[PDB]
């Protein structure tokens, strides 16, 4: 924990040169709902388009209740109504998603830690060895009673949601819940097992589309060694320490390794790929995979 400066300049161009130097072998991405908004899944805290500005109609106490396990156990219907409203007709990962697929294909991706539940990382070609779905997934669902715990695929959970029938276990008639980690629930064991080992060896943190306002996910940025560069690609800055409360430091006089590239995640990953000589690879990959999905 000695603060050395490994980037020759605190810019995207400097990150790029660093990524193609020998020091940079193991990349961890930390991603949130910002990387899937351009796919038609709204985020939470964007004013106007975010979910928190769009929950008046669910008769809830307050907005946050619809993502709390307690409230869900009492009343699962609002969440499942919300689920129907948000369920996209087509699952098409973004440029940002395929950028992380490129890191994998190039041997650079040590892990992607995602707060998203939309499965778009899997569809882009990230495999369980690449992925920590820190807040679970809609891909599988389980009977909640410590008894059945029987598993149902997304195909079955989707039908329940669209036919507006609350999912019950065929074997025990208990409620069937998407494998999502609600607020107040414990994160999967794989989250902790990976983070204890992944952050000993990481050479670059790539943080994309997340307000870094959910714990313990947001604490991941402080797990990297102090000389590990950290690039944020996001609409606005995030992860700086409150002036009253190892946060991000892009702007202070002591800034030495944090870089904030401000804009759309799709645009930031495009710009980074160009610097890397990957732009055509990335365009070809996105066009081919979107074409394949468009023809499903």
């Amino acid at each position: 924990s000695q603060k050395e400066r490994l980037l020759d300049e605190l810019t995207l161009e400097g990150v790029a040169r660093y990524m193609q130097s020998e020091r940079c072998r193991r990349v961890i991405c930390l991603v949130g709902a910002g990387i899937s908004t351009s796919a038609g899944i709204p985020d939470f805290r964007s004013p106007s388009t975010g979910l928190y500005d769009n929950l008046e109609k669910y008769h809830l106490p307050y907005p946050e209740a619809i993502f709390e396990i307690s409230y869900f156990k009492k009343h699962p219907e609002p969440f499942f109504a919300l689920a129907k409203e948000l369920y996209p007709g087509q699952f098409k990962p973004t440029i940002c998603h395929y950028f992380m697929r490129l890191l994998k294909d190039k041997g650079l991706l040590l892990r992607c830690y995602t707060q998203n539940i939309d499965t778009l990382e899997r569809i882009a070609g990230l495999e369980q060895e690449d992925l920590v779905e820190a807040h679970g997934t809609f891909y599988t669902s389980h009977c909640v009673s410590a008894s059945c715990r029987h598993e149902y695929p997304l195909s079955w959970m989707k039908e329940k949601i669209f036919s507006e029938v609350t999912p019950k276990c065929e074997d025990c008639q208990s409620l069937v819940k998407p494998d999502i980690v609600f607020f107040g629930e414990s994160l999967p064991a794989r989250f902790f097992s990976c983070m204890q080992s992944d952050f000993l060896k990481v050479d670059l943190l790539l943080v994309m589309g997340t307000s870094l306002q959910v714990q313990p996910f947001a604490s991941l940025i402080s797990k990297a060694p102090l000389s590990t560069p950290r690039l944020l690609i996001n609409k606005e800055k995030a992860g700086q320490s409150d002036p009253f409360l190892g946060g991000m430091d892009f702007d202070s006089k002591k800034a030495y390794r944090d870089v904030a590239w401000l804009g759309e995640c799709d645009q930031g990953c495009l710009a980074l790929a160009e610097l890397l000589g990957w732009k055509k690879e990335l365009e070809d990959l996105v066009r081919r995979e979107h074409a394949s999905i468009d023809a499903q």
Binding site: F182, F183, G184, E185, S186, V214, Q215, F217
Partner: peptide
Amino acid sequence: PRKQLA
């Protein structure tokens, strides 16, 4: 610990 806000 548990998934929390703030």
